[PDB]
Amino acid sequence: SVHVPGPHAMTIQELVDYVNARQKQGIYEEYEDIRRENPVGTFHCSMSPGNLEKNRYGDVPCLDQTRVKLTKRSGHTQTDYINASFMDGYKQKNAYIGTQGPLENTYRDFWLMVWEQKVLVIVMTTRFEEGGRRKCGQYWPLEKDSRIRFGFLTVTNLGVENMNHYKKTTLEIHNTEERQKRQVTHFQFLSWPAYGVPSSAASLIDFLRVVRNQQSLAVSNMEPPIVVHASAGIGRTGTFCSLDICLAQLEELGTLNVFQTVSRMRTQRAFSIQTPEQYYFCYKAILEFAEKEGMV
């Protein structure tokens, strides 16, 4: 994984001092420093005709070097392309697939990716619409017993649990060609607006724990990536994954480095973390968690 502690992992108390020294504006300047880093990679597949329409946003391509390729294609319009990026996690290659909110014309691509990448957990940190603007397609059967066939992948909703700030949807993916079935858990976090931070870092971290627990549970029953998406799949997605990585490293090694995490993440899911507020949120969420956990 690109996410190794080195070379400047910080303890939680050093993180407190670091944030105190830099303050919000210093952290914002640090985010700008990240935004300016020489972008290593190309976006040719994203920009190819045929694939342009598969990008929700003209300004959010995905890197060639880390993209999730679709193998079992069908139909001229299904290229190997989905706007989806393999993302390392803490001590884990390809812990996530960061991807955009599926478009009607990429629903089937999305589920193909979920099938091919053996995904067990989908994390969605977007509503379908914000400001009456569609931000994500309704790419999964919303109501229990509802199903949608995406070619040879039939997705059936097995139940929806409505929690505080998120919804947990149990999906069956039935590969009807291979006669194979898999349960995928779909988590939709509802209180994290685009370009924003979650209303409560504690709610996000609890959600992170729920996601982790479900990933761990599903895996104990087979490591596949967790699909993490928002609308573009970069801002809230990068923030979610970065927080996850930092918290995981904090838990295991007592250290973290937000700047390293985000910088490295942006070499995999380009443009990860989309506002300085989200970048600052990573720090503040960690510090708030640290306080709540008596670590500081």
């Binding site: 929700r56 946003y57 003209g58 300004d59 970069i234 801002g235 989309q274």
Partner: peptide, 7 residues
């Protein structure tokens, strides 16, 4: 024409 980051 759909942009994620707009001013």
């Amino acid at each position: 024409v759909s942009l994620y980051t707009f001013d």
